[PDB]
Amino acid sequence: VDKFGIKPEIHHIFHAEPKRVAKPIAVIFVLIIFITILSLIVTWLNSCAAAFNNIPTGVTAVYFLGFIATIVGFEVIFARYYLGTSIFETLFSSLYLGAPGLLTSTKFLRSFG
Amino acid sequence: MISDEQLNSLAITFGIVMMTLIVIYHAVDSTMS
Amino acid sequence: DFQETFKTSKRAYFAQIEKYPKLKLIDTFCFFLVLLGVIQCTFIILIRDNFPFNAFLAGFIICVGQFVLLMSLRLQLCNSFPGISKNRAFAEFIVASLILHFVCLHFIN
Amino acid sequence: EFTKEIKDASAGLLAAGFIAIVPGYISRSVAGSYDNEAIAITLLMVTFMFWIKAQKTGSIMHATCAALFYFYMVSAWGGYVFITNLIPLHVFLLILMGRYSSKLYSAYTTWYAIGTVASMQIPFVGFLPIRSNDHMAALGVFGLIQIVAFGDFVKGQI
Amino acid sequence: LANDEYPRSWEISNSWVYISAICGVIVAWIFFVVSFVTTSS
Ligand SMILES: *[C@@H]1O[C@H](CO)[C@@H](O[C@@H]2O[C@H](CO)[C@@H](O[C@@H]3O[C@H](CO[C@H]4O[C@H](CO)[C@@H](O)[C@H](O)[C@@H]4O)[C@@H](O)[C@H](O[C@H]4O[C@H](CO)[C@@H](O)[C@H](O)[C@@H]4O[C@H]4O[C@H](CO)[C@@H](O)[C@H](O)[C@@H]4O[C@H]4O[C@H](CO)[C@@H](O)[C@H](O)[C@@H]4O)[C@@H]3O)[C@H](O)[C@H]2NC(C)=O)[C@H](O)[C@H]1NC(C)=O
Ligand SMILES: CCCCC/C=C\C/C=C\CCCCCCCC(=O)O[C@H](COC(=O)CCCCCCCCCCCCCCC)COP(=O)([O-])OCC[N+](C)(C)C
Ligand SMILES: CCCCC/C=C\C/C=C\CCCCCCCC(=O)O[C@H](COC(=O)CCCCCCCCCCCCCCC)COP(=O)([O-])OCC[N+](C)(C)C
Ligand SMILES: C[C@H]1CC[C@]2(OC1)O[C@H]1[C@H](O)[C@@H]3[C@H]4CC[C@@H]5C[C@H](O[C@H]6O[C@@H](CO)[C@H](O)[C@@H](O)[C@@H]6O)[C@@H](O)C[C@@]5(C)[C@@H]4CC[C@@]3(C)[C@@H]1[C@H]2C
Ligand SMILES: C[C@H]1CC[C@]2(OC1)O[C@H]1[C@H](O)[C@@H]3[C@H]4CC[C@@H]5C[C@H](O[C@H]6O[C@@H](CO)[C@H](O)[C@@H](O)[C@@H]6O)[C@@H](O)C[C@@]5(C)[C@@H]4CC[C@@]3(C)[C@@H]1[C@H]2C
Ligand SMILES: C[C@H]1CC[C@]2(OC1)O[C@H]1[C@H](O)[C@@H]3[C@H]4CC[C@@H]5C[C@H](O[C@H]6O[C@@H](CO)[C@H](O)[C@@H](O)[C@@H]6O)[C@@H](O)C[C@@]5(C)[C@@H]4CC[C@@]3(C)[C@@H]1[C@H]2C
Ligand SMILES: C[C@H]1CC[C@]2(OC1)O[C@H]1[C@H](O)[C@@H]3[C@H]4CC[C@@H]5C[C@H](O[C@H]6O[C@@H](CO)[C@H](O)[C@@H](O)[C@@H]6O)[C@@H](O)C[C@@]5(C)[C@@H]4CC[C@@]3(C)[C@@H]1[C@H]2C
Ligand SMILES: C[C@H]1CC[C@]2(OC1)O[C@H]1[C@H](O)[C@@H]3[C@H]4CC[C@@H]5C[C@H](O[C@H]6O[C@@H](CO)[C@H](O)[C@@H](O)[C@@H]6O)[C@@H](O)C[C@@]5(C)[C@@H]4CC[C@@]3(C)[C@@H]1[C@H]2C
Ligand SMILES: C[C@H]1CC[C@]2(OC1)O[C@H]1[C@H](O)[C@@H]3[C@H]4CC[C@@H]5C[C@H](O[C@H]6O[C@@H](CO)[C@H](O)[C@@H](O)[C@@H]6O)[C@@H](O)C[C@@]5(C)[C@@H]4CC[C@@]3(C)[C@@H]1[C@H]2C
Ligand SMILES: [Mn+2]
């Protein structure tokens, strides 16, 4: 009776996509982390750990600002990589920031330390 | 183009020169220091 | 037994740390970098799931790597290595930290 | 460079002359041989060089360079696992001989952290550095070197 | 499925805890660098 009649239907059976945690518990843990970071910053400031005493002045100041800009800058670049920016644009912005940023940072560290 | 025997001679000459010059360098480094 | 040793160690630490502010800074940072880690582990245990495993690994490895880099910085600041000054240890720490940040941002997708 | 790190520059020149024309390496790097080893044997050596410079100086920068070229080798060839097992063993041996120092902590911890987080980005490797046996030595030595380090500080009191 | 066809990290509620940690760490690191260079021993 094979080779001749009609064959029954077949339907694929798909697997299960992973379950995701309910949003309130994740929100609670994000609040925990935010409180922890606020704790860290206030702990630093309350103690004399960070006292902002050796602030550069004069010409060294601008070098300081260049060092700060290079540091924040790279971070910003990475954030934009996290948002969707390509890897080639990331490497090009990294080179453009890293040449003069490296010069300014080396000069700051060589003149203030 | 270059032949096969010619490339063999060239490789052997490069090797011999390199070994002779590393021996001379070692003799000058060991003797003068 | 060990009580006297622990008390002497506490006096020594409180001395050193209030004689050098930077070692305080580092210490504080490291402690909280432990806290965060603990928190993340707590979450993974409580929800009893590891759906995005790369995200957990990134969030955990960033903390442990920042901790170990801060510890290397502290070792080089308390007693410097022969051919490496304190400025060069600080700059090496900055470079390594930036590289770790980039890799952990790529990991989490 | 590696042999200059071992003995001196004359020995390094001898080693370079040897490895330039030795047949054991030429067998798999002849013009036309376009296999994974054509580059791997290079990266390997470079990695080792940096690691040596990282182990005896204590530099964080040299450990970072070693980790970056270790990532290059992981991305280029499957025998990277050799390095993943050789660098810990070294450290482990230095612990048993009584030769622990802060430079060892710096170098090995920096290398392990950066190279491990970076070697998981190759989709063919993936989560193997944390779930496989040929990667469990390194992680083990990453824990031991903590217990030693802390313990060393305690030894300073008593 | 390609690599850029999966859901992004900010869309899975589970990853929210792990992004926050990383984000907080980076901000703290920036502050630490500044506070390190502007303090005197
Ligand atoms: C490496 O290469 C090798 C060789 O090339 C690859 O090996 C091949 O792998 C195939 C699977 O991908 C495999 O094919 C399967 O074989 C199964 C076993 O068959 C044997 O046993 C049965 C008795 O159980 C005999 O009848 C049969 O003749 C064989 O001797 C079968 O069970 C599979 O059949 C199912 O799938 C085909 C098509 O996918 C359907 O036509 C068939 O009707 C079955 O469909 C059921 O299951 C699917 C899900 O699998 C459902 O979607 C579907 O709706 C059906 O579900 C109903 O039935 C199930 C019970 O089966 C029930 O639980 C459910 O509730 C529903 O009622 C299939 O034929 C090859 O044999 C194998 N070849 C060799 C030589 O080994 C290997 O994959 C490669 N590796 C890789 C790629 O990584
Ligand atoms: C202070 C300096 C800071 C910079 C540090 C620089 C490097 C850090 C060192 C190692 C980091 C490793 C992780 C980065 C991987 C980037 C690849 C990438 O980019 O592939 C990605 C994705 O494919 C992959 O994952 C596959 C893995 C790729 C394997 C690596 C290729 C082998 C090449 C080896 C090196 C060759 C040397 C050059 C040739 C001589 C494409 O991204 P996308 O274009 O879709 O952008 C979108 C950005 N989303 C995704 C975040 C939104
Ligand atoms: C950094 C250190 C690097 C050390 C060196 C590295 C590698 C070299 C070692 C071995 C390579 C062996 C190559 C074999 C040659 C195969 C082709 C062949 O056999 O050419 C030969 C010819 O040759 C020659 O007359 C060349 C004579 C002198 C050449 C000029 C000096 C070379 C300078 C090199 C750099 C130049 C750049 C200057 C920038 C400052 C066959 O010509 P043909 O009959 O096919 O031409 C077609 C027929 N016409 C002639 C009518 C067109
Ligand atoms: C690098 C570190 C620092 C930066 C950061 O941490 C890691 O990484 C950031 C991400 O970029 C996150 C944003 C992603 C985009 C997302 C858009 C949503 O809205 C869209 O929703 C679509 C469908 O619903 C509509 O089609 C659209 O039109 C509509 O814009 C919005 O609700 C939330 C938002 C903005 C995410 C917030 C948190 C961010 C900024 C994260 C930061 C904390
Ligand atoms: C002193 C401070 C000054 C402010 C700042 O720090 C230093 O420096 C700013 C930068 O200029 C950033 C912007 C870059 C351009 C970027 C284009 C995006 O478009 C994307 O939208 C995604 C979906 O949301 C798509 O997936 C992607 O493909 C698509 O590229 C847009 O959304 C966000 C935007 C404007 C960045 C926001 C963060 C900014 C303002 C940064 C601040 C933190
Ligand atoms: C500084 C670096 C750059 C320069 C270089 O590396 C070191 O050093 C060069 C050498 O000088 C090599 C030549 C040697 C002479 C040899 C003669 C053959 O000449 C044929 O043609 C007629 C000629 O009278 C006859 O018939 C026969 O002698 C013969 O058949 C010719 O085939 C090959 C040739 C020219 C070599 C080629 C490679 C060279 C240029 C080498 C370069 C790679
Ligand atoms: C500071 C420098 C300056 C001086 C120099 O270095 C030091 O000192 C010279 C040597 O005299 C070298 C020659 C030795 C003889 C050797 C014969 C080979 O010919 C056949 O020898 C048979 C034997 O068994 C094989 O069976 C065959 O296979 C093989 O072809 C030939 O290939 C290479 C050749 C000529 C060497 C080349 C380099 C020389 C000239 C060297 C100079 C560059
Ligand atoms: C102290 C040591 C010893 C104990 C241990 O390490 C630390 O701690 C264990 C964890 O519990 C780990 C598992 C969690 C679940 C996780 C699911 C992943 O699945 C992903 O698979 C991708 C395909 O590439 C998909 O794309 C993604 O969607 C999908 O999430 C899988 O890859 C890895 C796996 C199984 C973890 C690794 C092994 C375990 C058991 C670890 C041990 C080795
Ligand atoms: C102390 C440090 C650590 C904490 C942190 O830095 C400072 O500050 C955190 C913020 O709290 C950020 C979260 C805000 C809530 C936000 C909800 C979004 O979901 C949207 O989704 C859209 C599509 O449906 C819907 O339209 C919208 O309504 C819906 O809100 C989600 O994308 C991103 C998420 C979870 C942010 C992640 C990064 C966090 C934790 C940031 C860290 C970097
Ligand atoms: Mn092969």
Shortest Cα–Cα distance, C1 to chain A (Å): 33
Q: In Å, how far are C76, D56, D64 from D103, measured between CA atoms?
A: 9, 7, 14
Say if C20 is an interface residue toward chain A (CB within 8 Å).
no
Pocket test for ligand 9, best of E11, E13, E15, E19 (most atoms within 8 A of CB): E19
* Amino acid occupying residue A100: P
* Helical residues (DSSP H) of chain D, grouped into ranges: 2-6, 9-21, 23-26, 37-57, 60-76, 81-96, 102-119, 128-131, 136-157
Q: Is the dihedral of CA A111, C98, C83, D150 positive or negative?
A: positive
CB within 8 Å: E22 and C109:
no
For residue E24, what are the contacts with CB-CB under 8 A and spacing of at least 6?
Answer: A33, A34, A36, A37, C36
Closest residue of chain A to C37, computed from CA coordinates? A33
Gap between the Cα atoms of C61 and D104, Å rounded: 21
Chains D and B touch (3+ CB pairs under 8 A): yes
Residue C51, burial from CB neighbour count under 10 angstroms (0-12, 13-18, 19+) = middle
Ligand 3 centre to CA of B1 (Å) is 9
For residue E20, what are the contacts with CB-CB under 8 A and spacing of at least 6?
Answer: A29, A30, A33, A34
Q: Which structural technique was applied? A: cryo-EM
Gap between the Cα atoms of E39 and C25, Å rounded: 10
Chain E partners of A40 at a C-beta cutoff of 8 Å? Answer: 28
Residue A42, burial from CB neighbour count under 10 angstroms (0-12, 13-18, 19+) = exposed
* C81 vs D103, D113, D127: nearest CB: D103
Tokens of D2: 């590696």
Site of tokens 């059976």 = A13
Q: Is the dihedral of CA D124, D53, C72, A70 positive or negative?
A: negative
Q: Which of A19, A21, A77 to mutate to test the interface with C (most CBs of C within 10 A)?
A: A21
Q: Is the dihedral of CA C58, C59, C64, C65 positive or negative?
A: positive
Can you tell me which atom of ligand 8 is nearest the CA of C53? 30
Gap between the Cα atoms of C78 and C99, Å rounded: 24
SS3 C109: coil
Gap between the Cα atoms of E9 and C97, Å rounded: 22
* Amino acid occupying residue D87: I
CB atoms within 10 A of CB D101: 15
Gap between the Cα atoms of D44 and D65, Å rounded: 13
Asked if A112 contacts A60 with a C-beta cutoff of 8 angstroms, the reply is yes
Asked if E33 contacts A72 with a C-beta cutoff of 8 angstroms, the reply is no
Shortest Cα–Cα distance, A37 to chain E (Å): 6
Chain E partners of A67 at a C-beta cutoff of 8 Å? Answer: 37
Chain D residues within 8 Å of chain C (Cβ atoms): 57-61, 63-64, 68, 102-103, 105-106, 109-110, 113-114, 116-118, 120-121, 127, 130, 157-158
Q: What is the resolution of this structure in A?
A: 2.8
Site of tokens 């965060």 = C36
Residue C108, burial from CB neighbour count under 10 angstroms (0-12, 13-18, 19+) = buried
Gap between the Cα atoms of C70 and C64, Å rounded: 10
Asked if D81 contacts C18 with a C-beta cutoff of 8 angstroms, the reply is no
3-state helix, strand, coil in chain E (%, to 5): 70, 0, 30
